[PDB]
């Protein structure tokens, strides 16, 4: 539903 | 939410479906076009709705009382600075360089 950001 | 009203890309309390159709209207050529809106399911919060190869995505934005904009592990002084950052650097997704998406233009609010 809502977008998840990822860290390296 | 009243303080963001000066910006032409802020649409206020429009719905997720309306926002999705606004940024999808021009299709995959509108890759990167965005708007900002209040969240309708988690009231008090805001959403960055943008076009990713013709599909609409919704990124949550949390605003401190001072106006600072927190996006998960990212912090910015303002939503404007958040927008300018993503105009220059890709939104960090798992697919990395394979799904490079930077914010381009914006949908002007229907006022």
Numbering used by the authors:
A (entry chain C): 453 to 460
B (entry chain A): 328 to 438
The study reports:
The SH2B family of adaptor proteins, SH2-B, APS, and LNK are key modulators of cellular signalling pathways. The LNK SH2 domain, unlike APS but similarly to SH2-B, adopts a monomeric structure and binds its target sequences in a canonical linear, extended conformation.
To understand how the EPOR pY454 peptide, which contains a leucine at the +1 position, could bind the LNK SH2 domain with high affinity, we determined the complex structure to 2.35 Å resolution. Overall, the structure is very similar to the LNK SH2/JAK2 pY813 structure with an RMSD of 1.0 Å over 111 residues (DALI34). The LNK SH2 domain accommodates the leucine of the EPOR pY454 peptide at the key +1 position in a subtly different manner to the glutamate of the JAK2 pY813 peptide. The aliphatic portions of both the +1 glutamate and leucine sit on a hydrophobic surface of LNK, however the glutamate sidechain bends so that the carboxylate faces away and forms a salt bridge with Lys 384. Although the +1 residues in the EPOR and JAK2 peptides differ, glutamate vs. leucine respectively, their binding can be accommodated by the same hydrophobic residues in the +1 pocket.
